[PDB]
Design a protein around this ligand. Structure first.
Ligand SMILES: *[C@@H]1O[C@H](CO[C@H]2O[C@H](C)[C@@H](O)[C@@H](O)[C@@H]2O)[C@@H](O[C@@H]2O[C@H](CO)[C@@H](O[C@@H]3O[C@H](CO[C@H]4O[C@H](CO)[C@@H](O)[C@H](O)[C@@H]4O[C@@H]4O[C@H](CO)[C@@H](O[C@@H]5O[C@H](CO)[C@H](O)[C@H](O)[C@H]5O)[C@H](O)[C@H]4NC(C)=O)[C@@H](O)[C@H](O[C@H]4O[C@H](CO)[C@@H](O)[C@H](O)[C@@H]4O[C@@H]4O[C@H](CO)[C@@H](O)[C@H](O)[C@H]4NC(C)=O)[C@@H]3O)[C@H](O)[C@H]2NC(C)=O)[C@H](O)[C@H]1NC(C)=O
Ligand SMILES: *[C@@H]1O[C@H](CO[C@H]2O[C@H](C)[C@@H](O)[C@@H](O)[C@@H]2O)[C@@H](O[C@@H]2O[C@H](CO)[C@@H](O[C@@H]3O[C@H](CO[C@H]4O[C@H](CO)[C@@H](O)[C@H](O)[C@@H]4O[C@@H]4O[C@H](CO)[C@@H](O[C@@H]5O[C@H](CO)[C@H](O)[C@H](O)[C@H]5O)[C@H](O)[C@H]4NC(C)=O)[C@@H](O)[C@H](O[C@H]4O[C@H](CO)[C@@H](O)[C@H](O)[C@@H]4O[C@@H]4O[C@H](CO)[C@@H](O)[C@H](O)[C@H]4NC(C)=O)[C@@H]3O)[C@H](O)[C@H]2NC(C)=O)[C@H](O)[C@H]1NC(C)=O
Lengths: 43, 206, 206, 43
């Protein structure tokens, strides 16, 4: 814990319509660049 | 040989800043037959490595071999089956082992913070209590802070199943009577899947 | 075969009205060789029977054999060694097992009773907490009462070792918000060796 | 629990000078007749 990296992680994890790969992608880019950690949401 | 399979630490599957690992600990294997081919499956699919990392140990009178599959936070929280399989030839059958989490439907913990008793202010060390109740699954992580910074002085009880079909725990911070009496802020910081951002915090102040 | 050896229940060694038993549970023995001669020693001396009572069970694909040596309250509290030995012929060596209590020097428990939190009176079931701390050995027994009579509605956590080198526990009585608000007397009744008559009781009332 | 059977039990158990057999006797008669449970003390 620290950042909104996780706040962002949480959301993208609980995205109802963010289908599978669509989610996995967002979560992983979000491990890779916490900076970018704010980049969330498709549907 | 015997193959145990352990979960990731709940904190480590909860926090994206952390990294969850499913550890397959076999104790035996033998010499002349050390050739234990670990097989790692996730839901149905074999993961090859999926960054599987067995590191050899030389124990007892026998070998202690462990492979650590790293897990996606998401997958384990969405409960996939982490199936470990150990091969060999001294071993007539592939020793299979499945883990995943609980399976129930998450229940959000209730975090109330309890002050020392007056009868305990007759002691010159007091105790601070956090009751965390009605959660599910048992996979939780509580910690304490002083004013805003880590307190290492705490003891947490194991989650024990209540009448509810929930879990509960207590966590006991022992501070100095003076340290309490000076109206100093204390806080218990609980981490569980069914919390606002997998995280919450509740404060004890005089 | 494998020989486990269990202690008497702490309540049962504490209360003269009760009867303490040291239970030697072996699971295996086999057929063609069922002839497991139990051997019971107390401190040094063999006790013959000393009212030893093995009662045969027929399980799994194998036999589950248990002998129960009854103990003098005094002896176990004064920590004698309860040595169980299982013989046979399919068994090259007498499987030996020693129990006794802790060994430390008793420490008297601290029983403080904690009311529900105000944030919990927003629930219409509340929780009553008893903190029992700084005891030794871990051998304790807590129970709850309502007004003067048994409450079956409680959950006790396992003794967990504190920074002190003591043990502690919590016990959580869940009552109805109304049942608390009507200024009804509740009480936690703790039983441990280092208490006044092996017994104490502390009251929670609105 | 119930009685002074145990109150009596406690004492006789914590008798400093009630040597071994001297104690064991008192405690056992005290299981056998709770009625008599009040009969305690030599030294
Ligand atoms: C030859 O020697 C070796 C080693 O011996 C030592 O001692 C010698 C004297 C010396 O000379 C040396 O050889 C050496 O120092 C012997 O190996 C031992 O073998 C036994 C089995 O025979 C094993 O016992 C099992 O242990 C399980 C628990 O294991 C954890 O705890 C022990 C004790 O602390 C540790 O030793 C062990 O390493 C485990 O720690 C946990 O490890 C994981 C993985 O590293 C940690 O993972 C975290 O992962 C996250 C990921 O994000 C993160 O990275 C963290 O940082 C990581 O730490 C995890 O945190 C660790 N935990 C903690 C608290 O730190 C027991 O569960 C197991 O018991 C089950 O099975 C048996 C058998 O069936 C049952 O009888 C038993 O009842 C129980 O069954 C059921 O299990 C369920 C799951 O637990 C349970 O829910 C259920 O209720 C239960 N059922 C019932 C009815 O109760 C068993 O006791 C030893 O672990 C192993 N020792 C070592 C050091 O590895 C070898 O036998 C011997 N050969 C001989 C004698 O022939
Ligand atoms: C063939 O089948 C049988 C039976 O199988 C069942 O299931 C089948 C599917 C079915 O078909 C039937 O066959 C049958 O229904 C198999 O038997 C099992 O075998 C295993 C071992 O292989 C045993 O496991 C051990 O269990 C110990 C704990 O035992 C208690 O709990 C279990 C689970 O509830 C109970 O089953 C058991 O009966 C015990 O209950 C306690 O019993 C006592 C005596 O009755 C009670 O006494 C009280 O006494 C007072 C006296 O005043 C008073 O009278 C009270 O009223 C009495 O009740 C007591 O209260 C009970 N407890 C409770 C809570 O009620 C484990 O401790 C043990 O684990 C230790 O050893 C293993 C092996 O080395 C380690 O791996 C493990 O880590 C651990 O090691 C160390 O132990 C220390 C002590 O615990 C510990 O402090 C230390 O930390 C630990 N070290 C580490 C590193 O962790 C082990 O798990 C099963 O119990 C047994 N099942 C039964 C039903 O008996 C058989 O194997 C099978 N054959 C095969 C498969 O080949």
């Amino acid at each position: 814990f620290n950042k909104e990296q996780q706040n962002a992680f949480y959301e993208i994890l609980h995205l109802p319509n963010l289908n599978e790969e669509q989610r996995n992608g967002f979560i992983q880019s979000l491990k890779d660049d916490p900076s970018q950690s704010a980049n969330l949401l498709a549907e | 040989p015997s193959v145990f399979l352990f979960p990731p630490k709940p904190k480590d599957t909860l926090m994206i800043s952390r990294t969850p690992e499913v550890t397959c600990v076999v104790v035996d294997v033998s010499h002349e037959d050390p050739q234990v081919k670990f097989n790692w499956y996730v839901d149905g699919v074999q993961v090859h490595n999926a960054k599987t990392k067995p590191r050899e140990q030389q124990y007892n009178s026998t070998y202690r071999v462990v492979s650590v599959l790293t897990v996606l936070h998401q997958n384990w929280l969405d409960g996939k089956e982490y199936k470990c399989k150990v091969s060999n030839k001294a071993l007539p059958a592939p020793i299979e082992k499945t883990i995943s989490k609980a399976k129930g439907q998450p229940r959000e913990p209730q975090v109330y913070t309890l002050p020392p008793s007056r009868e305990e202010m007759t002691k010159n060390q007091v105790s601070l209590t956090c009751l965390v109740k009605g959660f599910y699954p048992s996979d939780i992580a509580v910690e304490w802070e002083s004013n805003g910074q880590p307190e290492n002085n705490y003891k947490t009880t194991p989650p024990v199943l209540d009448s509810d079909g929930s879990f509960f725990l207590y966590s006991k911070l022992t501070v100095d009577k003076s340290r309490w009496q000076q109206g100093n802020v204390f806080s218990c910081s609980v981490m569980h899947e069914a919390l606002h951002n997998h995280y919450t915090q509740k404060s004890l102040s005089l």
